[PDB]
Design a protein around this ligand. Structure first.
Ligand code: UDP
Ligand code: NAG
Ligand code: MG
Length: 310
Protein backbone atom coordinates (compact mmCIF):
# COMPACT_ATOMS: atom_id res chain seq x y z
CA UNK A 1 0.00 0.00 0.00
CA UNK A 2 1.10 3.57 -0.77
CA UNK A 3 -1.27 6.52 -0.29
CA UNK A 4 -5.06 6.77 -0.41
CA UNK A 5 -7.92 8.44 -2.26
CA UNK A 6 -11.27 9.66 -0.92
CA UNK A 7 -14.63 9.14 -2.56
CA UNK A 8 -18.20 9.39 -1.24
CA UNK A 9 -17.00 9.63 2.34
CA UNK A 10 -14.82 6.50 2.20
CA UNK A 11 -11.02 6.38 2.28
CA UNK A 12 -9.53 3.84 -0.13
CA UNK A 13 -5.91 2.67 0.07
CA UNK A 14 -4.04 2.72 -3.21
CA UNK A 15 -3.27 -1.02 -3.38
CA UNK A 16 -0.30 -2.27 -5.44
CA UNK A 17 -0.33 -4.30 -8.63
CA UNK A 18 3.23 -5.52 -9.01
CA UNK A 19 5.03 -5.84 -12.35
CA UNK A 20 4.42 -9.60 -12.39
CA UNK A 21 0.67 -9.00 -12.78
CA UNK A 22 -0.24 -10.45 -16.20
CA UNK A 23 -1.51 -8.35 -19.09
CA UNK A 24 -4.66 -9.43 -20.93
CA UNK A 25 -5.79 -8.82 -24.50
CA UNK A 26 -8.92 -10.24 -26.11
CA UNK A 27 -9.84 -11.18 -29.67
CA UNK A 28 -13.21 -12.78 -30.41
CA UNK A 29 -13.51 -13.31 -34.16
CA UNK A 30 -16.91 -13.48 -35.84
CA UNK A 31 -15.47 -14.11 -39.33
CA UNK A 32 -12.33 -16.29 -39.16
CA UNK A 33 -12.47 -16.64 -42.96
CA UNK A 34 -11.05 -13.13 -43.35
CA UNK A 35 -7.66 -14.60 -42.34
CA UNK A 36 -5.52 -17.09 -44.19
CA UNK A 37 -5.84 -20.76 -43.33
CA UNK A 38 -2.40 -20.60 -41.68
CA UNK A 39 -2.71 -16.98 -40.51
CA UNK A 40 -2.85 -15.81 -36.91
CA UNK A 41 -6.61 -15.04 -36.67
CA UNK A 42 -6.22 -11.64 -34.98
CA UNK A 43 -6.80 -8.42 -36.92
CA UNK A 44 -3.58 -6.77 -38.07
CA UNK A 45 -4.51 -4.15 -40.68
CA UNK A 46 -2.95 -0.72 -41.10
CA UNK A 47 -5.95 0.87 -39.34
CA UNK A 48 -6.07 -1.82 -36.61
CA UNK A 49 -2.58 -3.35 -36.15
CA UNK A 50 -3.79 -5.25 -33.12
CA UNK A 51 -1.60 -8.35 -33.46
CA UNK A 52 1.36 -5.99 -33.89
CA UNK A 53 0.29 -4.02 -30.80
CA UNK A 54 0.00 -7.20 -28.73
CA UNK A 55 3.45 -8.37 -29.86
CA UNK A 56 4.91 -4.94 -29.08
CA UNK A 57 3.43 -5.11 -25.57
CA UNK A 58 4.90 -8.59 -25.10
CA UNK A 59 8.32 -7.31 -26.20
CA UNK A 60 8.14 -4.27 -23.92
CA UNK A 61 6.91 -6.35 -20.95
CA UNK A 62 9.34 -9.21 -21.46
CA UNK A 63 9.18 -10.29 -17.80
CA UNK A 64 5.37 -10.37 -17.65
CA UNK A 65 2.86 -13.00 -18.75
CA UNK A 66 0.77 -11.70 -21.67
CA UNK A 67 -2.55 -13.50 -22.03
CA UNK A 68 -4.47 -13.46 -25.30
CA UNK A 69 -8.06 -14.63 -24.77
CA UNK A 70 -9.32 -15.71 -28.19
CA UNK A 71 -12.58 -17.12 -29.46
CA UNK A 72 -14.14 -18.09 -32.76
CA UNK A 73 -14.52 -21.05 -35.11
CA UNK A 74 -10.84 -21.18 -36.02
CA UNK A 75 -9.43 -23.55 -38.61
CA UNK A 76 -6.78 -26.08 -37.64
CA UNK A 77 -4.06 -24.06 -39.35
CA UNK A 78 -5.14 -20.90 -37.53
CA UNK A 79 -4.80 -22.69 -34.18
CA UNK A 80 -1.35 -23.93 -35.23
CA UNK A 81 -0.45 -20.32 -36.07
CA UNK A 82 -1.54 -19.28 -32.56
CA UNK A 83 0.65 -22.03 -31.09
CA UNK A 84 3.55 -20.78 -33.21
CA UNK A 85 2.97 -17.31 -31.78
CA UNK A 86 3.04 -18.78 -28.27
CA UNK A 87 6.41 -20.32 -29.14
CA UNK A 88 7.95 -17.23 -30.77
CA UNK A 89 7.16 -15.12 -27.68
CA UNK A 90 7.63 -17.03 -24.43
CA UNK A 91 5.48 -14.68 -22.33
CA UNK A 92 2.49 -14.84 -24.72
CA UNK A 93 -0.09 -17.39 -23.56
CA UNK A 94 -3.06 -18.04 -25.85
CA UNK A 95 -6.21 -19.01 -23.94
CA UNK A 96 -9.21 -20.34 -25.84
CA UNK A 97 -12.42 -19.13 -24.21
CA UNK A 98 -14.06 -22.53 -24.74
CA UNK A 99 -11.37 -24.12 -22.54
CA UNK A 100 -12.54 -22.15 -19.49
CA UNK A 101 -15.47 -23.31 -17.37
CA UNK A 102 -17.79 -20.38 -16.59
CA UNK A 103 -20.67 -22.40 -15.10
CA UNK A 104 -19.93 -21.18 -11.55
CA UNK A 105 -20.95 -17.66 -12.65
CA UNK A 106 -24.11 -18.76 -14.48
CA UNK A 107 -27.78 -18.45 -13.58
CA UNK A 108 -31.05 -19.63 -15.10
CA UNK A 109 -32.97 -16.94 -16.97
CA UNK A 110 -36.28 -18.29 -15.66
CA UNK A 111 -34.91 -17.96 -12.11
CA UNK A 112 -34.04 -14.29 -12.69
CA UNK A 113 -37.49 -13.63 -14.17
CA UNK A 114 -39.34 -15.44 -11.36
CA UNK A 115 -37.35 -13.64 -8.66
CA UNK A 116 -38.04 -10.29 -10.32
CA UNK A 117 -41.77 -11.05 -10.58
CA UNK A 118 -41.81 -11.95 -6.89
CA UNK A 119 -39.93 -8.78 -5.94
CA UNK A 120 -42.24 -6.57 -7.99
CA UNK A 121 -45.24 -8.28 -6.38
CA UNK A 122 -43.73 -7.81 -2.91
CA UNK A 123 -43.92 -4.02 -3.19
CA UNK A 124 -46.98 -1.79 -2.64
CA UNK A 125 -49.29 -1.70 -5.65
CA UNK A 126 -48.93 2.08 -6.01
CA UNK A 127 -45.20 1.83 -6.84
CA UNK A 128 -44.92 -1.43 -8.82
CA UNK A 129 -43.21 -1.15 -12.19
CA UNK A 130 -46.07 -2.75 -14.11
CA UNK A 131 -44.64 -2.17 -17.59
CA UNK A 132 -41.45 -3.95 -16.53
CA UNK A 133 -43.57 -6.70 -14.94
CA UNK A 134 -45.28 -7.24 -18.28
CA UNK A 135 -42.02 -7.25 -20.22
CA UNK A 136 -40.44 -9.76 -17.82
CA UNK A 137 -43.50 -11.98 -18.19
CA UNK A 138 -43.21 -11.91 -21.99
CA UNK A 139 -39.48 -12.65 -21.76
CA UNK A 140 -40.18 -15.66 -19.52
CA UNK A 141 -42.93 -16.85 -21.87
CA UNK A 142 -40.54 -16.72 -24.83
CA UNK A 143 -37.87 -18.54 -22.81
CA UNK A 144 -40.37 -21.31 -22.04
CA UNK A 145 -41.30 -21.46 -25.73
CA UNK A 146 -37.75 -21.66 -27.11
CA UNK A 147 -35.36 -22.99 -24.44
CA UNK A 148 -36.53 -23.39 -20.82
CA UNK A 149 -32.94 -24.02 -19.66
CA UNK A 150 -31.66 -20.71 -21.08
CA UNK A 151 -29.11 -19.03 -18.83
CA UNK A 152 -26.99 -15.89 -18.67
CA UNK A 153 -24.03 -17.69 -20.22
CA UNK A 154 -26.01 -19.46 -22.95
CA UNK A 155 -28.02 -16.38 -23.92
CA UNK A 156 -24.89 -14.21 -24.11
CA UNK A 157 -23.12 -17.02 -26.00
CA UNK A 158 -25.68 -16.70 -28.80
CA UNK A 159 -24.81 -13.02 -29.26
CA UNK A 160 -22.69 -12.10 -32.27
CA UNK A 161 -21.35 -8.66 -31.33
CA UNK A 162 -19.62 -6.75 -28.55
CA UNK A 163 -22.02 -7.89 -25.81
CA UNK A 164 -20.59 -11.42 -25.97
CA UNK A 165 -16.95 -10.49 -25.54
CA UNK A 166 -17.88 -7.91 -22.86
CA UNK A 167 -19.59 -10.71 -20.92
CA UNK A 168 -16.67 -13.09 -21.22
CA UNK A 169 -14.18 -10.30 -20.47
CA UNK A 170 -15.86 -9.70 -17.11
CA UNK A 171 -16.00 -13.42 -16.30
CA UNK A 172 -12.34 -13.95 -17.21
CA UNK A 173 -11.32 -11.03 -15.01
CA UNK A 174 -13.28 -12.61 -12.17
CA UNK A 175 -11.15 -15.71 -12.68
CA UNK A 176 -8.05 -13.51 -12.66
CA UNK A 177 -4.64 -15.16 -12.81
CA UNK A 178 -6.45 -18.42 -11.98
CA UNK A 179 -7.73 -18.59 -15.57
CA UNK A 180 -4.15 -19.09 -16.79
CA UNK A 181 -3.68 -22.05 -14.45
CA UNK A 182 -7.12 -23.43 -15.32
CA UNK A 183 -6.19 -23.43 -19.02
CA UNK A 184 -2.91 -25.26 -18.43
CA UNK A 185 -0.59 -22.42 -19.47
CA UNK A 186 2.91 -23.66 -18.64
CA UNK A 187 5.89 -21.53 -17.70
CA UNK A 188 3.74 -18.83 -16.11
CA UNK A 189 6.31 -18.78 -13.38
CA UNK A 190 5.12 -15.57 -11.63
CA UNK A 191 1.40 -16.33 -11.39
CA UNK A 192 -0.08 -16.84 -7.91
CA UNK A 193 -3.48 -18.43 -7.31
CA UNK A 194 -5.88 -15.59 -6.63
CA UNK A 195 -3.62 -13.19 -8.51
CA UNK A 196 -4.96 -10.21 -10.42
CA UNK A 197 -4.90 -9.16 -14.06
CA UNK A 198 -4.65 -6.04 -16.25
CA UNK A 199 -6.97 -6.19 -19.26
CA UNK A 200 -6.10 -3.79 -22.09
CA UNK A 201 -7.82 -3.12 -25.39
CA UNK A 202 -5.47 -4.14 -28.20
CA UNK A 203 -5.35 -0.50 -29.38
CA UNK A 204 -3.80 0.57 -26.04
CA UNK A 205 -0.26 1.19 -27.28
CA UNK A 206 2.45 0.53 -24.71
CA UNK A 207 5.31 3.01 -25.16
CA UNK A 208 7.27 1.81 -22.13
CA UNK A 209 7.20 -0.44 -19.11
CA UNK A 210 4.22 -0.15 -16.79
CA UNK A 211 6.06 -0.76 -13.53
CA UNK A 212 3.98 -1.15 -10.39
CA UNK A 213 0.47 0.31 -10.35
CA UNK A 214 -1.39 1.72 -7.34
CA UNK A 215 -5.16 1.66 -7.63
CA UNK A 216 -8.00 2.41 -5.17
CA UNK A 217 -8.94 -0.90 -3.51
CA UNK A 218 -6.86 -2.54 -6.23
CA UNK A 219 -9.12 -1.70 -9.19
CA UNK A 220 -9.29 0.93 -11.93
CA UNK A 221 -10.97 1.11 -15.35
CA UNK A 222 -10.67 3.22 -18.46
CA UNK A 223 -12.32 6.62 -18.62
CA UNK A 224 -13.16 7.66 -22.16
CA UNK A 225 -12.87 11.41 -22.71
CA UNK A 226 -14.06 11.73 -26.32
CA UNK A 227 -15.47 15.11 -27.25
CA UNK A 228 -17.13 17.07 -24.45
CA UNK A 229 -18.17 14.11 -22.25
CA UNK A 230 -16.48 11.47 -20.14
CA UNK A 231 -17.62 7.96 -19.32
CA UNK A 232 -16.51 4.92 -17.37
CA UNK A 233 -15.30 2.35 -19.88
CA UNK A 234 -14.10 -1.26 -19.93
CA UNK A 235 -11.33 -0.73 -22.51
CA UNK A 236 -8.97 -1.08 -19.53
CA UNK A 237 -9.81 -3.14 -16.44
CA UNK A 238 -7.06 -3.63 -13.87
CA UNK A 239 -7.61 -5.73 -10.74
CA UNK A 240 -5.07 -6.78 -8.11
CA UNK A 241 -6.81 -10.08 -7.30
CA UNK A 242 -9.26 -12.67 -8.52
CA UNK A 243 -12.96 -12.40 -7.60
CA UNK A 244 -12.60 -8.66 -7.06
CA UNK A 245 -15.58 -7.31 -5.07
CA UNK A 246 -16.39 -4.59 -7.64
CA UNK A 247 -16.61 -7.04 -10.55
CA UNK A 248 -18.33 -9.55 -8.29
CA UNK A 249 -20.91 -6.86 -7.56
CA UNK A 250 -21.33 -6.31 -11.30
CA UNK A 251 -22.06 -10.02 -11.61
CA UNK A 252 -24.49 -9.73 -8.70
CA UNK A 253 -26.37 -6.95 -10.50
CA UNK A 254 -26.53 -9.08 -13.65
CA UNK A 255 -27.85 -11.97 -11.53
CA UNK A 256 -30.61 -9.70 -10.20
CA UNK A 257 -31.61 -7.48 -13.15
CA UNK A 258 -33.78 -9.12 -15.84
CA UNK A 259 -31.88 -7.55 -18.75
CA UNK A 260 -28.45 -6.89 -17.29
CA UNK A 261 -25.78 -5.58 -19.64
CA UNK A 262 -22.19 -6.80 -19.14
CA UNK A 263 -20.90 -3.23 -19.58
CA UNK A 264 -23.60 -0.96 -18.13
CA UNK A 265 -24.27 -3.27 -15.16
CA UNK A 266 -21.36 -5.70 -14.99
CA UNK A 267 -18.75 -2.93 -15.04
CA UNK A 268 -20.25 0.53 -14.50
CA UNK A 269 -23.01 -0.62 -12.15
CA UNK A 270 -20.66 -2.80 -10.12
CA UNK A 271 -18.09 -0.03 -9.74
CA UNK A 272 -20.64 2.60 -8.77
CA UNK A 273 -22.34 0.30 -6.25
CA UNK A 274 -19.05 -0.86 -4.73
CA UNK A 275 -17.72 2.71 -4.46
CA UNK A 276 -21.11 4.28 -3.57
CA UNK A 277 -21.35 6.56 -6.62
CA UNK A 278 -25.10 7.10 -6.62
CA UNK A 279 -27.06 9.31 -9.01
CA UNK A 280 -26.76 12.03 -6.35
CA UNK A 281 -22.96 11.85 -6.38
CA UNK A 282 -20.67 13.68 -8.80
CA UNK A 283 -20.09 11.28 -11.70
CA UNK A 284 -17.12 13.36 -12.88
CA UNK A 285 -15.43 13.13 -9.48
CA UNK A 286 -15.88 9.35 -9.50
CA UNK A 287 -14.40 9.18 -13.00
CA UNK A 288 -11.34 11.10 -11.82
CA UNK A 289 -11.10 8.82 -8.77
CA UNK A 290 -11.30 5.47 -10.60
CA UNK A 291 -9.54 6.45 -13.85
CA UNK A 292 -6.69 4.23 -15.02
CA UNK A 293 -3.95 6.70 -15.95
CA UNK A 294 -0.52 5.86 -17.35
CA UNK A 295 2.03 7.95 -19.23
CA UNK A 296 3.41 4.86 -21.01
CA UNK A 297 0.08 3.90 -22.64
CA UNK A 298 -1.25 5.61 -25.76
CA UNK A 299 -4.93 5.01 -25.14
CA UNK A 300 -7.75 4.09 -27.53
CA UNK A 301 -5.76 4.58 -30.72
CA UNK A 302 -8.76 3.13 -32.61
CA UNK A 303 -10.28 6.63 -32.39
CA UNK A 304 -7.58 7.86 -34.79
CA UNK A 305 -8.86 5.44 -37.45
CA UNK A 306 -11.94 3.21 -37.15
CA UNK A 307 -13.36 0.97 -34.44
CA UNK A 308 -12.96 -2.77 -35.06
CA UNK A 309 -16.59 -3.62 -34.18
CA UNK A 310 -18.60 -0.42 -34.82
O1 UDP B 1 -14.26 -8.28 -33.82
C1 UDP B 1 -13.87 -7.79 -32.74
C2 UDP B 1 -13.82 -6.40 -32.42
C3 UDP B 1 -13.39 -6.00 -31.21
N1 UDP B 1 -12.97 -6.90 -30.25
C4 UDP B 1 -12.51 -6.45 -28.94
O2 UDP B 1 -12.94 -5.11 -28.73
C5 UDP B 1 -11.83 -4.31 -28.28
C6 UDP B 1 -12.06 -2.86 -28.61
O3 UDP B 1 -11.59 -2.58 -29.94
P1 UDP B 1 -11.58 -1.10 -30.51
O4 UDP B 1 -10.63 -0.32 -29.68
O5 UDP B 1 -11.35 -1.10 -32.01
O6 UDP B 1 -13.07 -0.58 -30.29
P2 UDP B 1 -13.55 0.74 -29.55
O7 UDP B 1 -14.35 0.20 -28.37
O8 UDP B 1 -12.40 1.62 -29.16
O9 UDP B 1 -14.49 1.39 -30.57
C7 UDP B 1 -10.63 -4.98 -28.93
O10 UDP B 1 -9.42 -4.64 -28.28
C8 UDP B 1 -10.98 -6.46 -28.77
O11 UDP B 1 -10.65 -6.93 -27.47
C9 UDP B 1 -12.99 -8.26 -30.49
O12 UDP B 1 -12.63 -9.09 -29.66
N2 UDP B 1 -13.45 -8.63 -31.73
C1 NAG C 1 -18.49 4.71 -27.31
C2 NAG C 1 -18.53 3.21 -27.39
O1 NAG C 1 -18.92 2.63 -28.40
N1 NAG C 1 -18.11 2.55 -26.31
C3 NAG C 1 -18.04 1.10 -26.26
C4 NAG C 1 -19.02 0.53 -25.23
O2 NAG C 1 -20.36 0.86 -25.59
C5 NAG C 1 -18.87 -0.99 -25.16
O3 NAG C 1 -19.65 -1.53 -24.10
C6 NAG C 1 -17.40 -1.36 -24.94
C7 NAG C 1 -17.17 -2.85 -25.01
O4 NAG C 1 -17.40 -3.34 -26.32
O5 NAG C 1 -16.59 -0.78 -25.96
C8 NAG C 1 -16.63 0.63 -25.95
O6 NAG C 1 -15.75 1.17 -26.88
MG1 MG D 1 -10.32 1.53 -29.01
Amino acid sequence: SSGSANFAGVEYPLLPLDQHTPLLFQWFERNPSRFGENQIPIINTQQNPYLNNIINAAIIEKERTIGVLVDGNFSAGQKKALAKLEKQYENIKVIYNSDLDYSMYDKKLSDIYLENIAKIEAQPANVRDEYLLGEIKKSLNEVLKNNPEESLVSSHDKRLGHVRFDFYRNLFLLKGSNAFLEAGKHGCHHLQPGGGCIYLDADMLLTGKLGTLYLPDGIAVHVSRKGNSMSLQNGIIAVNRSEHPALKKGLEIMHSKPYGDPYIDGVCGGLRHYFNCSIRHNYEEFCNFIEFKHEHIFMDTSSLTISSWR
